[PDB]
Structure formats: C-alpha cells, structure tokens
Amino acid sequence: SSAHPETEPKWWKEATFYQIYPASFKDSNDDGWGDMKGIASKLEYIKELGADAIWISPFYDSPQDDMGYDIANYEKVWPTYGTNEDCFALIEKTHKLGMKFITDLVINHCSSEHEWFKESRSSKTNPKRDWFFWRPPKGYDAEGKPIPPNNWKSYFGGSAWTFDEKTQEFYLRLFCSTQPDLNWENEDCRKAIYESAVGYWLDHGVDGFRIDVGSLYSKVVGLPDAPVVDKNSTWQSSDPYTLNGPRIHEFHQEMNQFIRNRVKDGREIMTVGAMQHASDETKRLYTSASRHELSELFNFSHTDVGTSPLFRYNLVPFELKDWKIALAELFRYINGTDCWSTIYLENHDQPRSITRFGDDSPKNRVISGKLLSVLLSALTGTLYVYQGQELGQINFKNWPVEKYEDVEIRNNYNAIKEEHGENSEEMKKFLEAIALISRDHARTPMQWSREEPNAGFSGPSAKPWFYLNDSFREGINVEDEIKDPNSVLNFWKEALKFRKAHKDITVYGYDFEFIDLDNKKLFSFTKKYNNKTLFAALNFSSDATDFKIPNDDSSFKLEFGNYPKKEVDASSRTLKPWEGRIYISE
Ligand SMILES: OC[C@H]1O[C@H](O)[C@H](O)[C@@H](O)[C@@H]1O
Ligand SMILES: [Ca+2]
C-alpha cells in the first residue's frame, strides 16, 4: 500500500454520503414542500442507514426555475425551507449525531433575481455590467427578431442566450433563461462569489462543498460559434469552449486557496466537483492532492450510457461492457497517485439505477437492487447514496409529458416543437427517452410509509409540490421496508456495514482489474490491499452465469452477497439470477 498514496486515509474518502433533495425529502408543515425541520426530524434515519455525511441540494433563496440551482441569495435560506437559524440548527444537529455536512456550491451562474444581476442588467454602465456575459445581437433575422451572439445550445435545449429589452443586448445562460452565467474573467466578481457563496458557509460550519458544473467557469475568449456536430439541431453544444476551459485550474486553485485561508479552526474541508467529463489527465489536474484544487470529482460517463452523445434524450443501445468501462472511469486513474475518486449511481439529475442497470419488474426489483448495492459496496472512492436509492426506488411509469415538472423537459420539449414540430419523429424519440432518463425520476417525494395519498412525506390533506410515484403502494417505503427483513433497505444497511468493516480493500483498494471484461452478463473484478485480494462476481442478468476466480485456491472466502447467506454454496462457480458475491483472500 506504500506505492499507493491514494490509500492515505481521510474522513471524506471513507465517509458514505447521503444526498438529500430538500423539496422532496420531508415536509413538516403540510405545505407540500420538504423543509429543514423535516430533514432534521429524519437525521436519525440517515444515521441508522449507515451514512457518515450528508449533502443537501440547494436550499438558498431561489425562484425555483431550476429547483434551487437558480440562486437569488447565497446568504439566505429560501423561506419555504426555513430560516438561516433553522439551517444552522440543522448543521449542528447533524454534527452532534457524528455526521459531516456539505452544501451545494452553485457559482457558474446565479438567478437573474440575484441583486448582482438586477444591478448588472440595469444599464450598460453600472459597476456590475461585466459580472455577466453581455453581447449585442449578431444581427436581426428576416422577421425582425434579434439573432443571438453565437449558436450555443442551452443544457436544457434551445439557445444559450436571452435578450434583454432594456439594454438591447443578450446575456449568456447555459442553463435556463433566468440562470445568467457569472463572468469569472472579472476578478471583483470572483472575489464576491467567494465571500458570499463560500466564505459565508465556511463561517457557519460546513465541512465542504459539492460544486455544481464546476468545469464550466472558464469560457474561451470571444465565445466563438461551436462546431456544427449535430446536423439536425439549430443550436450546438458549447463544450469545446465552455468545458474545462483554459483558466479552469487557475480558478479552482484560487478558490481552494480562498477556502484554506478562510477556515478559522483548521478543519479538513472536502470539495467534490461535478465536473461532467474530463480526460484522465484533466481528472488528475483536478484531484491530485498536491494540486490543491478538488478533493474528488463526479464524471458522468456511467450515467450517460444508453444515451446519444449528441442529445441525452435520444436513446441508443448499450451493453454491460460499456457500463463497466464507464464506471471504471471514476476510479482507475487514481491508482498509484495522490488523487481520489467518487462512486455513485444516483443523484437529483438521474433516473433510478434499478430501472437503468437492474430490472425493475416486480419479480426482480428487490434482488437487482441488492446486486447494485453489492457492486457499490466494493468500489474504491467516496460512496454516495441518493434519497430513495436505499429503498430500491424505481422509475415512475406511464406519465404524460405535461405531468413532468422539470425545466429540462419543458425547454427541450419547446425547442423540439419549434424546430421539428410537436407531431414529429424528433418529438417521438424525445418522449421515448424521458420515460427512462428524466431527472424527475429522482424528484418525486420520498416514500416514508404506505399512507394514502402522500406516503408519509406530508400529511394526507397536503398537496405535494410534485406527484408521488405509485411505487409506495407496492411496498417501496421506509415503514414497510424496515419491517421486511428481506427489503432493499435492510440490505443496504448490511452493505454499508460490510464496506466499513473491510474498508481497507473496499474503500481504499487498488490495482483494480477486470475479469472477462467483454461478458454481457458477468461484471467481475479483483482489487488488492497489501496481502489481501478482493474478488467480485456479479450477475447482471436473469440467466444463471458462470465465473472463474483467477489464481483460485482455498483462501478466497465469501464475505458478502445478495442471495440468502445460509443458502449460498461459496464453492459453486455459477451465479444465480441477479446474484452477486464478494470474496476476500488473505
Ligand atoms: O445548475 C444547473 C444544473 O447543473 C447541474 O446539472 C445540477 O446538478 C443540475 O440540477 C442543474 O440543473
Ligand atoms: Ca413544508
């Protein structure tokens, strides 16, 4: 383990994080929106699951045009969630339970309702004009409408610019129309961002930050028209000019130094960057401890599988190997370095992992949910569990498009309508995809009980902010799963206990090697830690599947799996349907 600097322990390397989506976790006052008192009341549940830390999605004052990711004030809790004091009390309660607390740092962009933008947009001459990206129209079209400065596509569809009538210029918004991008080229802007979004929260005791689209802060000068890579789209991905831009490391080093100098009590701060995509070299530049940038990052290749590179909402075929390789992108690069990795399958931007990567049928949803838990329990990196993942939550079914809340759905729908027609092949493909891929599959209220109609998320008379998934009626809820010894919840409790007990090789294991990489059913690998060897054999299929242990002898003992502990023949070399096994040799 000496030629493996990545094995140096840190609280944040071996912490299991639980991600809370505040709108959808727990309502304490029957207004249909989750809130901080709700979260506080459920911290014991999170601790009992086995979590070491929580990440709460944005709870700051926000119009909710992107459900919190459009922030109007970094220093004020959205009143519907509570007061600032409620938040400080929540941080303290988390701490007093022996858990760490990270907050979501959303500083590529802010709300157009933020005072910075209200000032910026007020004239062309004000001190904050250049805190955002303002450009004149490229020209005017044949109908007299202003043409945006370039061809860039919003992450939510359509143009990445919005026209301001008052000042007669467009402003850049990679996200929704009310999320203007902050101009990191402006040093005064960067310093104000650090003070408000970072310093305030450090002063109030956070243990770290999850950094929203942290790879987007550096725009290539001139904001040039992007390559026309999609021949059936008006607008084009800005990635070459916005993703991992030339100043991105400079900016992350500066922010890291700010954090180091602002902390008052010497505590260890974790940063996890949602960096989206990066070469292995770029990943190392971000997460090498000696670089003083990020602690770790999320890379999205494993959650991209089965979606077109040109458009997330066009489905494409994939095979198990594609997912194996994409998952391994998270962690293989750290081998023999001072870098660190993340491990996750779900977040508030993703559909449910059982639906995507298991089998959500009534027959297989439990066993395949447990299989995914076996996989994640054994992988190197900081593990994240998303609210409801531990219950084996699945995608919702048969929802009409108008039922979806997500601005990502609404804006993409409207762009397709405009470009291709509502009754088009392009629309049909989109509607097919949303049923599998929409962020909204993550966002239906948390299911605490079988109680009609709100599943214990709120009282029975409340109208939830977003519809319940019918799955609560099918036993996917906290109360029913606690009482079922065979539940996905009780299994996740076991998986986290197993991971912690064997943390040297589960959390810090190295020299990851695939076994039978091409296999369309078997996901198998080994890892090392000094004298120890971990071997995984995981059957992602309803068919029985054979496996071999490389250098198989007598030392390989079965330490964890999803089939009944007393019924499994450890010497057998065929996995049952959806069976997973972790063997450890010493
Ligand atoms: O902040 C803009 C977007 O950034 C990331 O994708 C966030 O995780 C997502 O929820 C948000 O819509
Ligand atoms: Ca509420």
Side-chain angles (χ1 to χ4, degrees), residues 375-504:
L375 169 64
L376 295 178
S377 83
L379 297 173
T380 294
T382 303
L383 175 64
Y384 291 76
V385 175
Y386 179 68
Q387 63 170 60
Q389 185 176 0
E390 77 280 19
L391 303 179
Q393 178 67 120
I394 61 171
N395 277 16
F396 53 74
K397 305 293 171 180
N398 305 124
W399 283 29
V401 65
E402 60 266 26
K403 211 82 68 66
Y404 291 69
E405 64 79 33
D406 194 356
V407 63
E408 185 163 301
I409 298 300
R410 286 181 272 115
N411 290 8
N412 271 303
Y413 185 94
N414 290 146
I416 293 165
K417 178 175 71 183
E418 189 205 2
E419 291 178 42
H420 305 294
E422 215 159 16
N423 193 339
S424 65
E425 191 84 13
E426 292 84 2
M427 188 62 84
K428 288 186 283 284
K429 292 304 279 193
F430 175 75
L431 293 173
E432 174 189 78
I434 69 174
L436 177 64
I437 298 294
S438 178
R439 312 195 295 174
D440 275 343
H441 296 282
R443 301 181 178 192
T444 67
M446 179 74 175
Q447 295 167 10
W448 296 97
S449 74
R450 216 190 308 166
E451 191 181 19
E452 292 289 342
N454 297 327
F457 161 76
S458 198
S461 66
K463 178 65 196 63
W465 80 274
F466 187 42
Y467 304 95
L468 273 291
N469 186 322
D470 291 328
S471 69
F472 78 92
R473 296 175 180 144
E474 308 181 301
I476 304 189
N477 64 74
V478 171
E479 187 187 1
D480 290 341
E481 288 195 33
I482 285 172
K483 301 276 101 79
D484 174 10
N486 195 50
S487 68
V488 174
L489 173 61
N490 283 318
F491 193 83
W492 263 104
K493 290 183 180 185
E494 289 190 35
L496 297 180
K497 287 177 189 166
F498 161 70
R499 177 176 179 79
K500 195 72 77 195
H502 294 268
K503 67 182 181 182
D504 67 325

Side-chain angles (χ1 to χ4, degrees), residues 511-523:
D511 289 348
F512 181 99
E513 297 294 345
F514 282 115
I515 308 308
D516 198 0
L517 178 60
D518 287 8
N519 200 302
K520 290 174 180 176
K521 301 177 194 179
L522 180 67
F523 191 152

Side-chain angles (χ1 to χ4, degrees), residues 66 69 109 156 175 179 210 212-213 348-349 439 443:
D66 188 21
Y69 286 88
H109 48 267
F156 302 149
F175 294 85
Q179 284 166 116
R210 176 271 187 182
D212 185 59
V213 295
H348 64 294
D349 290 328
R439 312 195 295 174
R443 301 181 178 192

Side-chain angles (χ1 to χ4, degrees), residues 26-35 80:
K26 186 70 183 82
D27 181 12
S28 65
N29 57 12
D30 282 350
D31 71 354
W33 285 77
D35 50 65
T80 295

Side-chain angles (χ1 to χ4, degrees), residues 44 48 89 166 305 437 557 562:
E44 292 279 19
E48 168 68 25
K166 183 179 182 187
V305 297
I437 298 294
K557 296 294 174 185
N562 63 346

Side-chain angles (χ1 to χ4, degrees), residues 5-59:
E6 73 270 26
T7 64
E8 178 182 5
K10 298 287 178 172
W11 73 259
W12 48 266
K13 290 188 177 181
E14 59 183 79
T16 299
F17 278 77
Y18 187 85
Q19 182 193 354
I20 296 165
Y21 195 65
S24 298
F25 193 63
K26 186 70 183 82
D27 181 12
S28 65
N29 57 12
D30 282 350
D31 71 354
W33 285 77
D35 50 65
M36 286 185 172
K37 170 75 261 162
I39 295 163
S41 76
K42 296 299 188 186
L43 291 175
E44 292 279 19
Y45 165 85
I46 296 171
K47 185 80 183 75
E48 168 68 25
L49 173 65
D52 299 299
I54 62 173
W55 152 29
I56 310 184
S57 273
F59 50 74

